[PDB]
Amino acid sequence: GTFLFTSESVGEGHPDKICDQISDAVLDAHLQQDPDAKVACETVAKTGMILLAGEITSRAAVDYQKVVREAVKHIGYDDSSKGFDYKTCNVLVALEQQSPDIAQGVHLDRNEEDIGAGDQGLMFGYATDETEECMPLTIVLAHKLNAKLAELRRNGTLPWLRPDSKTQVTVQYMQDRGAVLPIRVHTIVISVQHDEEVCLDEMRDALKEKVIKAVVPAKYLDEDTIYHLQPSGRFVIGGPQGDAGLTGRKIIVDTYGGWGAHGGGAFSGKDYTKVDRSAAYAARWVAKSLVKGGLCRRVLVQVSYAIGVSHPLSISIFHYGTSQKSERELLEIVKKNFDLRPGVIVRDLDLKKPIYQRTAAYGHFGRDSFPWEVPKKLKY
């Protein structure tokens, strides 16, 4: 019955995650002034460069230089010694209006509740009772390891740390009628950018004692646990200088760490009319509602859309054997309790509110009691 499963996470200064955070800083800046902004903002990062590319139609007046640079400052890239500096980098903008053809087919002269999906696509939501926040333990731990690195960087106790980091956690599980039960942590990887002066032994000792032990309960660690700490041996070059970043290249980090499923759409830089984001948030809300409502211990939900059509084209449920009810019954409960038109999701989940930058690191789910994390009470 035992098996392994692995998930990863990345830090706030990982170059892909820099891009997600900038894209959502841009979205939030627009929504502050124009709650109905149409935003599709991609960010690209490489040595010395942030490029914004995409489509925005908005009544807001946004200072892209300021928004981008403040986001990079917050992340911690503030000096050439770290490989990137918000004060002196290049910010390039290639932004145009939303395509009139899209606008006319999606939202122009439509009642808000009846707006069309902003694209076709498929989206999934997942929940698991293995943690209180209904997320896989593998990714929860991976996220918390990156958060701990950022904490110890910012508080000055490990001043050799830089913002770019990756972590990976392999858990050994057992199973009970489709539910999954963590036993122990099998393997941990941590790679984090560092200054020129600190040695591998100092770093590896700190990563074990001040990072892993501060995050992972001792009951999951034993003599057999495998540690790969700074396994490349040197990580001085990092951030965009080490590796180009793009928006929407951490979509599994953003969601369920390999568990569940993914329909392919990125979240960051998009307003609620882009169902890649809004319907994935709603699908998480459905899944979590089913688990917290006691109908199943784990569940996967698929939805899909056509551009210009409000109601989903399909809805599907997979409960991994963890319900007494059939998947057909659960689907009927979902259909009776939820309205997954984007123009209704926006109301239920308050998706014109400018909170998106806070979603763009450490996962969109399982945190902070965002609206999609507050179960809906079900009637059945």
Ligand X SMILES: C[S@@+](CC[C@H](N)C(=O)[O-])C[C@H]1O[C@@H](n2cnc3c(N)ncnc32)[C@H](O)[C@@H]1O
The catalytic residue positions are 14, 16-17, 42, 55, 166, 235, 243-244, 249-250, 270, 274, 276
Contact 341, 260 (CB under 8 A): no
Task: Please report how close the Cβ of residue 316 comes to ligand YMW at its closest, in angstroms.
Answer: 4
Q: How far is the CB of 252 from ligand YMW (least distance, A)?
A: 11
Q: Which residues contact 186 (CB under 8 A, 6 or more apart)?
A: 4, 170, 171, 172, 224, 225, 226
Q: Measured from the CB of residue 374, what is the shortest distance to ligand YMW in angstroms?
A: 22
- Residue 25 as a binder of a second copy (CB under 8 A): the answer is no
CB 303 within 8 A of CB 126: no
Structural contact between residues 181 and 258, judged by C-beta atoms closer than 8 angstroms = no
- Which 94-153 positions form the footprint of a second copy (CB under 8 A)? 94, 96, 99-102, 104-106, 116, 120-122, 124
In terms of CB distance, is 259 or 356 closer to ligand YMW?
Answer: 259
| Closest alpha carbon to 320 in 173, 142, 169 | 173
Establish if 253 lies at the interface with ligand YMW (CB under 6 A): no
Distance between CA atoms of 36 and 333, rounded to whole angstroms?
32
What residues from 196 to 225 belong to the interface with a second copy (CB under 8 A)? none
Cβ of residue 15: shortest distance to ligand X, in angstroms?
5
Q: Does 191 bind ligand X (CB under 6 A)?
A: yes
Q: Is 288 helix (H, G, I), strand (E, B) or coil?
A: helix
Q: Are 76 and 13 in contact (CB under 8 A)?
A: yes
Secondary structure letter of residue 241 according to DSSP: G
Residue 3 touching ligand YMW (CB under 6 A): yes
Task: Please say which residue, 232 or 369, places its beta carbon nearer to a second copy.
Answer: 232
Q: How far is the C-alpha of 227 from the C-alpha of 204, rounded, in Å?
A: 9
CB 216 within 8 A of CB 225: no
**Residue in the block written with tokens 């979590």:** 288
Site for a second copy in 291-310 (CB under 8 A): 302, 304, 306-309
Residues within the interface to ligand X (CB under 6 A): 14-15, 40, 55, 98-99, 101-102, 105, 118-119, 164, 166, 191, 232, 234-235, 238, 242-243, 307
Residues within the interface to ligand YMW (CB under 6 A): 3, 175, 178, 180, 259, 261, 300-302, 316-318
